[PDB]
């Protein structure tokens, strides 16, 4: 039922990327792993939702 | 005359930002403070010719999406008349004069005058930068030129100067009427990052300083007060929060105008007559 009424998306699961300031606390605006965000994302994968 | 604090703000600070994020030890040294991560993320990101990111200011209440990374919000406040002149008499003059002007230019011999050549008619010098002339200079204005008698200063043929100096408009008499006000606007630095909120406050107290000595703001715009808020979330349901911390920036400025005067009066005349009774 679900594979027949879902369309297909990529799903990516989030993390905290490691590039948070030690002090302050905030995301480095510069970080290439997460663009200004304070959260990291692993590879894609193929679900239907 | 009639000013529009919000529009001065705008148009000063768009070049002075500009030229601080050019120059990377000038924002080395601002965030000299600072967490040693923030102050090298900040000047990766937004500093430097090479920035990829980029910083923007305009007014409020644009019709389409502004970089929320970072952008300096301009927000027109309140006002108030706090001193008036009796007769509203702000001032007078002989002869209409415009804004003031401060232009580069060189001295060069004509007739065995030195002059300099400035784009306007001069409507009154105030200063000709590091010279002060004695009476046997000869020093004179005419028209849109000063002229400075050659004999004894040969040796100055190509001096460069700066000429501080004021517009004329037209020779007419009048009244400069009007009081002075005291008004409010308010900046925020809006970004999705905290540490880049701090950052672009530190760079905009930075500017204001820098402004203060302006020509701009000593003939009007005087006494510049700061104030500032908290800071906090200014939008708090997208994906991500934005963060700003406002100042307000308080200025005291004439509002005037030129009421000129048609009369004049040339000759007075006498004449007796007799009375027989
Ligand atoms: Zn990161």
Same mark, same amino acid.
């Given at each position: 039922?679900? !594979? ?46 | *005359? ?20 050019? !120059? ?21 990101? /937004? ?11 305009? /007014? ?9 990374? *970072? ?10 008349? +706090? ?23 060189? *001295? ?25 002339? *004695? ?30 100096? +004021? ?25 999705? !990052? ?71 009066? !040339? ?11």
């Amino acid at each position: 039922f679900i !594979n027949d009424r879902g369309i297909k998306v990529l799903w990516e699961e989030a993390y905290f990327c490691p590039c948070l300031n030690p002090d302050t606390g905030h995301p480095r605006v510069d970080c290439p792993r997460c663009h200004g965000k304070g959260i990291a994302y692993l590879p894609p994968k193929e679900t239907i939702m | *005359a009639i000013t529009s604090v919000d529009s001065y703000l705008l148009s000063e600070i768009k070049p002075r930002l500009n030229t601080v994020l050019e !120059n990377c030890y000038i924002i080395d040294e601002v965030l000299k403070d600072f967490d040693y991560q923030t102050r090298e993320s900040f000047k990766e990101a /937004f500093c430097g010719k090479n920035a990829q990111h980029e910083v923007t200011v305009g /007014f409020n209440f644009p019709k389409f999406k502004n970089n929320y990374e *970072a952008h300096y919000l301009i927000q027109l406040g309140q006002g108030q008349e +706090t001193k008036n002149s009796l007769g509203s008499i702000q001032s007078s003059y002989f002869e209409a004069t415009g804004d003031t002007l401060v232009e580069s230019s060189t *001295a060069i011999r004509e007739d065995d005058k030195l002059v300099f050549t400035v784009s306007k008619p001069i409507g009154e010098l105030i200063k000709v930068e590091d010279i002060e002339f *004695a009476k046997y200079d000869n020093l004179q204005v005419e028209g849109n030129k000063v002229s400075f008698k050659y004999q004894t200063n040969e040796d100055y043929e190509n001096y460069n100067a700066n000429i501080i100096f +004021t517009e004329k408009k037209n020779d007419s008499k009048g009244l400069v009427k009007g009081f002075t006000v005291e008004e409010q606007v308010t900046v925020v630095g809006l970004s999705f !990052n905290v540490d880049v909120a701090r950052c672009l406050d530190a760079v905009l107290k930075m500017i204001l300083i820098s402004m203060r000595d302006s020509i701009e703001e000593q003939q009007t715009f005087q006494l510049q007060n700061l104030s500032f808020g908290d800071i906090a979330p200014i939008i708090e349901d997208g994906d991500s929060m934005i963060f700003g911390r406002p100042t307000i920036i308080k200025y005291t400025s004439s509002l005037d105008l030129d009421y000129t005067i048609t009369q004049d009066i !040339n000759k007075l005349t006498f004449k007796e007559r007799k009375d027989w009774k």
